Nucleic acid binder design. Structure first.
Ligand SMILES: [Mg+2]
Length: 97
DNA sequence: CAAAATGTAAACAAGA
DNA sequence: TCTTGTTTACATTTTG
């Protein structure tokens, strides 16, 4: 199908906010996106590289260490408290300020 | 308009 | 070899 209107910053924010403890692994972001929007089930090589790119580049996505090496691999990704509500509505179509 | 934000691709590295 | 994470580069879009 066609690509949804949501940006990569918006997609990552959805996954973090959806997590019960508001922290999510990189693979959990993949599964959240693909489960929510079937378009990203195809051609995983491209948009996942963009996902990683946005996690490191943007200050809003801060990586924090993990408890033990049991749940998956890598570290948890969380939202910088300043940019938690960086989107206006909760429809995630554009940022505020 | 200029600058910032964003999308996309890719070189690169540490580690299991 | 694969996964994760960082970084530079460039074109297009959005914002101020
Ligand atoms: Mg970051």
């Amino acid at each position: 199908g066609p690509k949804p209107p949501y940006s990569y910053i918006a997609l990552i924010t959805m996954a973090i906010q959806n997590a019960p403890e508001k922290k999510i692994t990189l693979n959990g972001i993949y599964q959240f996106i693909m489960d929510r929007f079937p378009f990203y089930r195809e051609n995983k090589q491209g948009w996942q590289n963009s996902i990683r790119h946005n996690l490191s580049l943007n200050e809003c996505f801060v990586k924090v260490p993990r408890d033990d090496k049991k749940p998956g691999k890598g570290s948890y990704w969380t939202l910088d408290p300043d940019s938690y509500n960086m989107f206006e509505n909760g429809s995630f179509l554009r940022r505020r300020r």
